[PDB]
Amino acid sequence: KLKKVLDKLRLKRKDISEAAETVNKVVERLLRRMQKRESEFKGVEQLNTGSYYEHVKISAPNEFDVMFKLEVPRIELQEYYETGAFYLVKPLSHFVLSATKMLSKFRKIIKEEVKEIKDIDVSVEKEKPGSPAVTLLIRNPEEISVDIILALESKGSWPISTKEGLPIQGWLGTKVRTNLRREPFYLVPKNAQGETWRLSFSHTEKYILNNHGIEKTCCESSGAKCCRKECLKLMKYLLEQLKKEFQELDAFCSYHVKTAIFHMWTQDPQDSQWDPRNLSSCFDKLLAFFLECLRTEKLDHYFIPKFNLFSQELIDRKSKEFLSKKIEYERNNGFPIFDK
Amino acid sequence: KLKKVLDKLRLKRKDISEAAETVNKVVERLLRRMQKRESEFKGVEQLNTGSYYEHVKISAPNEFDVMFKLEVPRIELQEYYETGAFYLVKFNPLSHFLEGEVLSATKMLSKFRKIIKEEVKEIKDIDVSVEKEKPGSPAVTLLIRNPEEISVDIILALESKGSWPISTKEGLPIQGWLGTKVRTNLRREPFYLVPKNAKDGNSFQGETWRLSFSHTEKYILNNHGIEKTCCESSGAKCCRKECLKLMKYLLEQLKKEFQELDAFCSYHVKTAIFHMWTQDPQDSQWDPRNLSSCFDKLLAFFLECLRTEKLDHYFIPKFNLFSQELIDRKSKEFLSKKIEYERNNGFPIFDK
DNA sequence: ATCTGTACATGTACAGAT
DNA sequence: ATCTGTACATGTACAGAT
DNA sequence: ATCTGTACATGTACAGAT
DNA sequence: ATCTGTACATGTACAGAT
Ligand SMILES: Nc1nc2c(ncn2[C@@H]2O[C@H](COP(=O)(O)CP(=O)(O)OP(=O)(O)O)[C@@H](O)[C@H]2OP(=O)(O)OC[C@H]2O[C@@H](n3cnc4c(N)ncnc43)[C@H](O)[C@@H]2O)c(=O)[nH]1
Numbered sequence: 001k002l003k004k005v006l007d008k009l010r011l012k013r014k015d016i017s018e019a020a021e022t023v024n025k026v027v028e029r030l031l032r033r034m035q036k037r038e039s040e041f042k043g044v045e046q047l048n049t050g051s052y053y054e055h056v057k058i059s060a061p062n063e064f065d066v067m068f069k070l071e072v073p074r075i076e077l078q079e080y081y082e083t084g085a086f087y088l089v090k091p092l093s094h095f096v097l098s099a100t101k102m103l104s105k106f107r108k109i110i111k112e113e114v115k116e117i118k119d120i121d122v123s124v125e126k127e128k129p130g131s132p133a134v135t136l137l138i139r140n141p142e143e144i145s146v147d148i149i150l151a152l153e154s155k156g157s158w159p160i161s162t163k164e165g166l167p168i169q170g171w172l173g174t175k176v177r178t179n180l181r182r183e184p185f186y187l188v189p190k191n192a193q194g195e196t197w198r199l200s201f202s203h204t205e206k207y208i209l210n211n212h213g214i215e216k217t218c219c220e221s222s223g224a225k226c227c228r229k230e231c232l233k234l235m236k237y238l239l240e241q242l243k244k245e246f247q248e249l250d251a252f253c254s255y256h257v258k259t260a261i262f263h264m265w266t267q268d269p270q271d272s273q274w275d276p277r278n279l280s281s282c283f284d285k286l287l288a289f290f291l292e293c294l295r296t297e298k299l300d301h302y303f304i305p306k307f308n309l310f311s312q313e314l315i316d317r318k319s320k321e322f323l324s325k326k327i328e329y330e331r332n333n334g335f336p337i338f339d340k
Numbered sequence: 341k342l343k344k345v346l347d348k349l350r351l352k353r354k355d356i357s358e359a360a361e362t363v364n365k366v367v368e369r370l371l372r373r374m375q376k377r378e379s380e381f382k383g384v385e386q387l388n389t390g391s392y393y394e395h396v397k398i399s400a401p402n403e404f405d406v407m408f409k410l411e412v413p414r415i416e417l418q419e420y421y422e423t424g425a426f427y428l429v430k431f432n433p434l435s436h437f438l439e440g441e442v443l444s445a446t447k448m449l450s451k452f453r454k455i456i457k458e459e460v461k462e463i464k465d466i467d468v469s470v471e472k473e474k475p476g477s478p479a480v481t482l483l484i485r486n487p488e489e490i491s492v493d494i495i496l497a498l499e500s501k502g503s504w505p506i507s508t509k510e511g512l513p514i515q516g517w518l519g520t521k522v523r524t525n526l527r528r529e530p531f532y533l534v535p536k537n538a539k540d541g542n543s544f545q546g547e548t549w550r551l552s553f554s555h556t557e558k559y560i561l562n563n564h565g566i567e568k569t570c571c572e573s574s575g576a577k578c579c580r581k582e583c584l585k586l587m588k589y590l591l592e593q594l595k596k597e598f599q600e601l602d603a604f605c606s607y608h609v610k611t612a613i614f615h616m617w618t619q620d621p622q623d624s625q626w627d628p629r630n631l632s633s634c635f636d637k638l639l640a641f642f643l644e645c646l647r648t649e650k651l652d653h654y655f656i657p658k659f660n661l662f663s664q665e666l667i668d669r670k671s672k673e674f675l676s677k678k679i680e681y682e683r684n685n686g687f688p689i690f691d692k
Numbered sequence: 693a694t695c696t697g698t699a700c701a702t703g704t705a706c707a708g709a710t
Numbered sequence: 711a712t713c714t715g716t717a718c719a720t721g722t723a724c725a726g727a728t
Numbered sequence: 729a730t731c732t733g734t735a736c737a738t739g740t741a742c743a744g745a746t
Numbered sequence: 747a748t749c750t751g752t753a754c755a756t757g758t759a760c761a762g763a764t
């Protein structure tokens with residue numbers, strides 16, 4: 001079934017162990033260098049985010065996301081247009097706090113430190129505009145990416161654009177939501193302008209992934225297992241496979257699928273609506289939801305409701321119809337792409 | 341119905357507001373006086389516990405429980421004869437209470453009590469005295485006349501941040517109800533020790549402390565569902581707390597009429613219902629529409645505890661609150677007859 | 693001048709009041 | 711159904727201390 | 729302030745039971 | 747084939763020591 005696919009996607013203990021040991025060496029070293037120097041990033045703290053740390057990494061342990069976040073007292077935001085997600089922001093003297101200038105110095109430091117590593121085969125990938133990350137390419141056994149993500153940490157209440165976000169009230173509840181919104185919020189230097197930062201809720205997304213049930217015992221050793229994470233794996237795999245074959249899908253990414261499933265988990269809050277016995281129905285209903293997002297050109301950021309990830313401005317109508325045909329096809333033919 | 345009883349039991353906002361305003365003044369003042377330097381209790385922090393703070397206080401807001409707890413870093417416990425709940429404490433602002441390396445409960449309580457009495461004398465704004473010391477209490481109890489009687493128990497507590505004592509390893513069996521993450525997190529919170537302060541005449545009388553988990557009990561009362569939305573504004577209401585109120589009321593009413601029941605206390609009913617909440621973890625087994633069944637099944641459980649002389653501390657499984665050594669079988673049979681009677685005759689005592 | 697333990701400012705769940 | 715007082719958790723301002 | 733030790737949740741691998 | 751129990755591996759929060 002889709003069970004055999006999940007078997008293939010399942011990471012191996014051996015591989016996890018080998019990847020993690022190399023990754024931690026490099027990260028531990030980068031993190032130390034940010035402290036030890038008369039460095040403007042002294043104080044930066046490490047936060048592990050994304051799939052591997054959410055336990056929804058598929059295929060291989062080869063992509064790791066780490067936040068190097070820095071406490072910045074009493075900063076003042078100004079929303080960059082009515083975009084909801086992008087802001088100007090107001091030790092760091094030489095960086096309005098310019099995202100690009102801060103990222104550059106951060107990146108310079110990392111590059112320098114990477115040169116000094118003689119026990120691991122590791123380089124710094126050429127910069128992509130649009131990435132807030134300094135990406136490391138590690139080879140030692142085989143290929144592993146590590147994104148080192150610079151983040152400002154603010155302790156204020158979250159910005160107004162998120163007031164109506166995180167609609168978990170009927171699923172995870174009001175106490176969970178109030179507590180989550182008492183955690184700090186993050187600003188990440190995302191930039192295709194050079195002074196614009198972007199809100200990040202990776203920390204919150206991680207908590208949700210690991211506390212995802214309406215029952216406190218969902219997926220615990222004295223609870224019942226659900227198939228919420230397995231659906232997310234399957235959906236991510238369908239996208240990766242399609243994306244590797246079709247250049248038309250360059251504008252799509254796994255965050256789109258993650259956002260979609262957060263909305264489905266809200267819409268279907270009950271653990272019994274994600275029974276492992278109903279993996280197919282569950283996967284199928286997720287596809288149907290994703291297709292509706294494509295058809296209506298609408299997939300709101302889960303934390304920032306006015307920010308449409310499927311706006312015309314971000315992803316072209318044709319790209320959306322293209323992905324629809326390809327999903328509808330896979331869906332109506334037993335997912336041939338799951339075999340390749 | 342039982343609904344009409346709960347109507348009577350429901351506290352009133354007016355009463356809550358008047359009681360709370362006076363109580364907080366007194367407590368805030370006592371807490372400040374503890375913080376004056378060359379007080380052995382400098383550092384003590386306030387923790388509100390018990391019914392009122394659990395929202396299961398019934399009838400009137402006239403009893404408040406407050407913990408004045410003090411962090412004591414380097415701590416060695418010694419269990420008092422395999423009892424599970426009682427300990428000597430060992431190893432400084434506390435210098436004067438030490439007998440060799442042993443922290444004297446009674447000496448510490450006495451000084452605490454002396455301070456409080458002194459501070460209470462200086463309050464001319466509120467009518468408040470210190471109740472005569474009751475054997476077995478870790479508390480300095482304040483009697484306030486707000487033209488209404490209000491008790492405040494100020495409970496002296498040691499706070500240890502270490503892992504909880506081994507006697508609790510098998511306690512707090514919430515795994516199938518609240519879950520493993522909740523349990524792990526709760527067990528990462530500190531544990532508390534309060535003076536046992538018995539007047540029996542047994543060895544180590546004045547140096548024996550007792551474990552308290554009031555802080556944990558509070559969290560459970562306010563996060564009591566298998567669903568995170570139990571009793572929230574986008575969830576379904578349960579009758580878990582309402583059963584606890586009803587059971588508490590049946591005991592209070594009986595206790596106020598019968599001296600035979602002096603050995604019984606509300607903690608017995610609280611412990612019983614914690615076991616029932618574990619046994620029946622699903623929110624749907626505490627549907628408000630099934631209040632009678634729910635109340636009835638709790639009574640039946642409590643009666644079985646009385647008949648078999650067994651009600652294990654929820655946190656300390658080997659400590660039987662209904663042992664022969666604590667409460668007489670005759671006392672237990674007496675309470676059984678009275679409950680069985682109320683149960684089989686429309687609860688006439690709810691009408692008094 | 694800088695630092696800080698204390699108290700205030702802000703936000704919301706719970707439950708009672710309307 | 712909507713409104714409201716209390717309790718509680720977290721952030722931040724500041725007179726008195728250094 | 730940084731570091732380590734402890735405890736346990738979330739995983740995977742595999743054998744015996746169903 | 748699926749479930750259950752055990753073993754083995756990693757991540758992560760926090761307390762006590764330095
Ligand atoms: N993390 C993240 N990615 C986002 C966001 N908005 C769009 N994206 C893009 O979606 C993809 C997801 O990348 P990740 O690997 O981080 C997500 P995962 O849960 O680990 O899942 P898989 O590893 O299984 O896929 C990427 O293509 C994102 O493109 P990008 O935004 O340029 O990401 C570049 C890298 O920088 C980090 N990063 C990006 N956005 C953020 C963010 N908001 N907060 C923190 N880190 C971020 C990350 O390492 C990424 O790989 C979005 O909000 N978050």
Ligand SMILES: Nc1nc2c(ncn2[C@@H]2O[C@H](COP(=O)(O)CP(=O)(O)OP(=O)(O)O)[C@@H](O)[C@H]2OP(=O)(O)OC[C@H]2O[C@@H](n3cnc4c(N)ncnc43)[C@H](O)[C@@H]2O)c(=O)[nH]1
Nearest residue numbers: 390391397403405476477478479493495552554605606607
């Ligand atoms: N809390 C508590 N009480 C216990 C315990 N073992 C016996 N008791 C006695 O039961 C009664 C319940 O006292 P509370 O008022 O704290 C319980 P509530 O949920 O607030 O319910 P109501 O206020 O609606 O009744 C008391 O009579 C206890 O008597 P005690 O134990 O001799 O102590 C007298 C007072 O001291 C405080 N106190 C008692 N035990 C503790 C404790 N373990 N931790 C902290 N404070 C405690 C309390 O103020 C009591 O009134 C037991 O384990 N817990």
Ligand SMILES: [Mg+2]
Nearest residue numbers: 050051063065
């Ligand atoms: Mg990733």
Ligand SMILES: [Mg+2]
Nearest residue numbers: 063064065147
């Ligand atoms: Mg990544």
Ligand SMILES: [Mg+2]
Nearest residue numbers: 403404405493
């Ligand atoms: Mg009391």
Ligand SMILES: [Zn+2]
Nearest residue numbers: 213218219226
């Ligand atoms: Zn689950």
Ligand SMILES: [Zn+2]
Nearest residue numbers: 565570571578
């Ligand atoms: Zn409830």
